[PDB]
Each structure stands twice: as C-alpha cells, then as structure tokens.
C-alpha cells in the first residue's frame, strides 16, 4: 500500500482519484474472488481520505485541491464506473467503502461528494448508483441519511424550479431508492418548526408517488430479511411513522405558520392520509404472509409517545389562537391512524396503553371511541 501512495502523490488529483478507484476495483474484486466476506482494511480508507476527499495526512504538505470542474470530472468518472460495474457485490462494497461514515473530519466532505453524486444520479438516471445509495441509506445512521435527503431536496425542490419532475421520473427507475428517499425525507421534515415544513413540490411528488403505487413504502420491508431487533439510530424499515406524523401535525403546523396554497396543502395531506390508511389496511395480509402478525410491529409505541406529547404541546400553544378546528382534525386523523394500525396489527399495544398515552390529549369523540 505504501508503494501506491508514492506513485499517486506524483499525479494530479483527478488522475490520482481515478487510479484509486481502479485499484479499489481490482482489490475488492480479488478479495471477493478469494473470500465471501471481504474485510475493509484501514489502507483503502486512508487512501480514499487522502486522494479522493483530500484530507492532508501531513501538516506541512500543501493539499492539492480539485476545482469544481475537476470534481465534476470525478463525479462523471465515478458514475461511469458504477454504470459499467457488472457485479453487484463489488459495486455495493465499493460504494460503502467510498461513503460509509468513519467518524472523522473527512465525513463532511464525503457527504458533500455523496450529496452531489446521488444528485447527478438523479439527473442522468444511473440505476446502479440509485440502488447503491438506497442500500447506503438503509445501512447508514439517520444523521447522514437526513443530510443526504436535505441535499437532494435542495438540488431538486428549492434551487432549480421545475427540476423536481426529473426526480419524479426516478420513481419508475429505482423504487427502492425512492422509498429510502421518502423515509429520509420524513425523518428530516418532522414539522416541528416553520423551517421544517416539507417543500410544497416535494410534498406533492411524495403524495403522487404513494398514491400511484402504495406498496412503494413497504418495498424495503418486502425485500429485507427482518432481524429480531431493529438497530437504534438508523432509518426505519418503513416510513409509515413519518407519514403519520406528517398527516397528524400538518393542520397545527400550518395554523402556527396563500389561502389557495393552504387549501392545496390540506387536500394533499388528506390524500396522503387516505393513502397511508389504505397501506395500513393492506399491511395485515403482508404481515400474515410472513408469519409476523402479532409478533412484529412496524409502528412502535415508543415512537408514538413523542408524537402524542408534541400534539399536546401544539394544542396547548395554539388554543388561544382559536385553533379548535385544526386540533379536532388532527385528533381525528390520529384516532383513525391508531384504530387502523391496531386493527391491522401494525401497532402492538393494549387499550390500556392507549388510555395511558392519550389521557393528556384534549377530548375527542373519535379518539374516545377508539380508546373505549
């Protein structure tokens, strides 16, 4: 590994990165040919940090920095390599080694690169890159998935007007990446603040994606071997919790925050709530087919407790502002979601648990009917 570093130090940054990628290809192909489980050694990670993310190992060495033009050359070469890589295991492992968080100062730069690379994958429709990004989002802690989702939403929803259509065309290309992007977006936009309301175009495109094919959200759940314990600190297997939070907290958040645009938002959120309810009813058959009915709950009670607390806080804050209608609508949506989840087995809890959880919420006829 020491010999290659000396040779790469004599090359330009773009050629050095290209040679790093080629050597990683050869090394990982050889390792997968020799062993079924390759071990990511410190050597490739240090090489990627020094020559791809440009983190200087020596204090007194001037860092050769890629200009934006040369970095775009790097992105083009990287996308071409992913498209040309036939074997999926090598592709996924190299994507992970390129973009797995390491807990060092380089990660930020890595994020930017990834936050751009996936964006480029959206523009030219590189399906392998989208699949690798979906796998990364599945295997990455939520803090980086939220950053990637925010970057993608910035590029395709807030910066270029009308470019979101391109992201919409991703739906027929990489549904797994679409589901993971929706999960990361729901993890990002929790409607807690006025700056965390999801973009209007992004909300519309998400609603259209769910309404066209409701099974999209469950695709990961339908394609991943479900372990007994879901890891803590990662994206959820199914973003149903995020959709419930969006649908229930939309009226209060919009009241806290254009009449026709607000009407459009209300209609879109009602459509999303109906689609999520339909997904919940259809979830029972999928749970039964996997012999998981009554054993695994895709909606967790420990995730619903903070939602109820936030609902109570928002209702208390908005009560003096004559927000009774919004509070009633939010409570009705929450009661409907809870009833459908309990009926379909998505939420594994007793009626006493709901009695304890919803005791602090304002009185609602539908909520009381569901509770009783």
């Amino acid at each position: 590994m020491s010999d290659i570093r000396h040779s790469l130090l004599r090359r330009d940054a773009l050629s050095a990165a290209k040679e790093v990628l080629y050597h990683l290809d050869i090394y990982f192909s050889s390792q997968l040919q020799s062993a079924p489980l390759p071990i990511v050694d410190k050597g490739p990670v240090e090489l990627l940090e020094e020559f791809v993310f440009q983190v200087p190992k020596e204090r007194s060495a001037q860092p050769k920095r890629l200009n934006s033009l040369q970095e775009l050359q790097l992105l083009e070469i990287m996308c071409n390599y992913f498209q040309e890589q036939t074997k999926d295991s090598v592709r996924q492992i190299i994507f992970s080694s390129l973009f797995s968080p390491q807990g060092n100062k380089a990660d930020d730069s890595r994020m930017s690169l990834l936050g751009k690379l996936v964006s480029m994958a959206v523009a030219v429709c590189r399906i392998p890159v989208l699949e690798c990004a979906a796998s990364w989002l599945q295997r990455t802690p939520v803090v980086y998935c939220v950053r990637l989702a925010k970057a993608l939403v910035d590029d395709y929803c807030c910066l270029v007007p009308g470019s979101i259509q391109t992201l919409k065309q991703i739906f027929s290309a990489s549904p797994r990446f679409c589901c993971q992007f929706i999960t990361s977006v729901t993890a990002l936009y929790d409607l807690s603040s006025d700056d965390l309301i999801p973009p209007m175009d992004l909300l519309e495109m998400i609603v259209t994606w769910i309404f066209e094919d409701p099974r999209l959200i469950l695709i990961t759940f339908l394609n991943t071997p479900i372990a007994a314990n879901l890891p803590i600190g990662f994206l959820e297997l199914t973003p149903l919790v995020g959709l419930i939070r969006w649908c229930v907290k939309a009226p209060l958040a919009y009241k806290r925050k254009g009449v026709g645009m607000d009407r459009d938002s209300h209609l879109l959120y009602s459509k999303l709530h109906l689609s999520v309810l339909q997904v919940l009813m259809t979830l029972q058959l999928h749970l039964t087919e996997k012999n998981l009915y009554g054993r695994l709950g895709l909606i967790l009670f420990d995730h619903m407790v903070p939602l109820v607390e936030e609902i109570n806080r928002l209702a208390d804050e908005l009560n003096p502002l004559n927000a009774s209608q919004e509070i009633e609508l939010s409570l009705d949506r929450l009661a409907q979601a809870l009833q459908v989840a309990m009926a379909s087995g998505a939420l594994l809890c007793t009626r006493d648990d709901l009695r304890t959880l919803c005791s602090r919420l304002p009185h609602n006829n539908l909520l009381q009917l569901v509770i009783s």
Binding site: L72, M120, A123, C125, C158
Partner: protein, 289 residues
C-alpha cells in the same frame, strides 16, 4: 438522460461552450459552480478584450445572455440565488480589479464590468428588504483583500445606496482602526461626500453620540478621519459647535477622555488643534466664540 449526458460531456471536454454551460445551469444543479467558474473565464478575457481596445467582439452577446439568465434566476427565487451569485460576482470584480472618479469612469466603460455591477445591484435590491448582510458582508469581506483597487464598486454602491453602505463602511473602518485600509475608507468617504454629505454627517454624529475596545477608540478614529479627509471635516464643522454645545455632552466627553493616559490625551488635543487650525470653512467665528 442521454441528451443531458451528451451535454455534460461536450461541456466538460467559446460562445457554444458558454451556452452549454448556461443550459447546464438551467438543467443540472450540481454543475452550477463549474459553469460559474467557466463563466469567470468568460468575463476576464472580455476585460482584456476591452483593455487592449483602450490601448489601441462576439462575447458581448454572451455576457448579455448570462445577464438575462442570472436576472431570470434571481426573479424566480431571490432568497436562494442572490447570495451565491452576488458572492461570485464580487469575487469576479475583485480579481479583475486586482489584475476614484477616474477609475469609476474607466471601469463602467467596460460592458462586462457594468454588467457585473448591474447583477450586484439587482441582487442587493432584492435583498435590501429582507437581509442584505450576506451581500454587504460579501462586499465588505472582499473589500479587505482588494483595496485600493476595489474601492470604486463600494463608491458606486454607496452612491446608489448610502443608508447602509455608509454605516457599514464606518463600522469596518473603526474595526480596522482598533485592530491596527483606513486610507481607502478616507478615499471613498471623500468621494461620496460631495453628494451625501448630509447622510455622512448624520452617521458620524450618531456614532459619536453612541460612543458617549471598539467604543473607546471612536473619538480618536473620528479625529484621524477628519485629519485625513478635508471633505468630512468640512461637512461636519457646520454642526460641530451645536454637537459639543450641551453641557452634558461636554461632561461625558471629559469623562470618556479621562480613561486614556496623558500621552493619548496629548494626541487627542493635538488632533483637535490640526482640525480647528486647518478645517473651518464658515463657522470659525462661531467656533472660536
């Protein structure tokens, strides 16, 4: 997908190349900076193509087209476009300046430079109402590294928008005075004096009153400014007597001055001597009375 890829490859591998860059700007977000960087190469050459023309043609349309594209991009979303384009444009002006009235006339004579100031003007005018700091800082920050070859953009903007530029210029000058550029501050203040003496005098008076490590040096900084620039002391001596007249103001002045050593108080006294010796235009009789 394929056409966008072909456009990317053709762009990465002058008029046609710049139009390819503009199409990528309109279509592919991640390449923006690269296109912007390429656009830098579009502008610098133009200035050379202008400067050599002064010593003794198809890219002016490119500059105009880029200006229309940028104007449309700002008008579509100012909050997201104005800061980035303004910073890139200010970097452009800084670099082509490195590489006051006479310089102003020389540089507005070039079409590319005029377009650069125009896109800055529209960006700030889009950001005056909500948050111009990201623009003004991008100006002020750049003004650090490109003085005195930069000053004339600041002069033009202050002429167009004095109410904030004058205050920011005075604040950054005071900061530099505390730390240690002040000649550039004197030059620009003298330049905008002839047309905005009222606002300059008002801002100086408000800073003087507000002072009554940054707040202790305001009066010595003001004295140094007046001794450097006849225009400002001529503008302010009209109401200097009315400003020092109230007994409370004079008492506060004494109390503030008590905080410095005798070497510094001697310097403060000696500065006033130069001002009242070589400053008064018409209030000399009233001042001496």
């Amino acid at each position: 997908a394929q056409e966008l890829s072909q456009e990317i490859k053709a762009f990465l591998t002058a008029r046609e190349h710049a139009r390819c860059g503009l199409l990528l700007l309109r279509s592919l977000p991640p390449a923006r900076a690269a296109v912007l960087d390429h656009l830098r190469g579009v502008f610098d050459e133009s200035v050379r193509a202008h400067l050599a023309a002064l010593d003794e043609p198809g890219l002016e349309d490119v500059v105009q087209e880029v200006q229309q594209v940028l104007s449309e991009f700002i008008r579509a979303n100012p909050k997201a476009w104005a800061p980035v384009i303004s910073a890139w444009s200010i970097d452009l002006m800084g670099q082509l300046s490195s590489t006051l009235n006479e310089l102003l006339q020389l540089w507005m004579g070039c079409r590319a430079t005029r377009t650069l100031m125009d896109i800055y003007v529209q960006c700030l005018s889009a950001l005056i109402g909500s948050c111009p700091d990201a623009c003004v800082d991008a100006l002020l920050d750049t003004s650090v590294q490109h003085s005195p070859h930069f000053d004339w953009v600041v002069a033009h903007i202050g002429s167009s928008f004095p109410g904030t530029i004058i205050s920011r210029v005075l604040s950054c000058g005071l900061k530099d005075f505390c730390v240690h550029k002040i000649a550039s501050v004197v030059g620009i203040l003298g330049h905008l004096a002839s047309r905005h003496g009222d606002s300059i005098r008002r801002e100086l008076l408000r800073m003087f009153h507000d002072s009554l490590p940054s707040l202790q040096a305001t009066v010595p900084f003001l004295l140094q400014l007046a001794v450097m620039s006849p225009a400002l002391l001529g503008t302010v001596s009209g109401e200097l007597v009315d400003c020092l007249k109230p007994p409370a103001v004079l008492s506060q002045l004494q109390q503030h001055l008590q905080g410095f050593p005798r070497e510094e108080l001697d310097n403060m006294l000696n500065l006033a001597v130069h001002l009242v010796s070589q400053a008064s235009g018409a209030g000399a009789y009233r001042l001496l009375q």
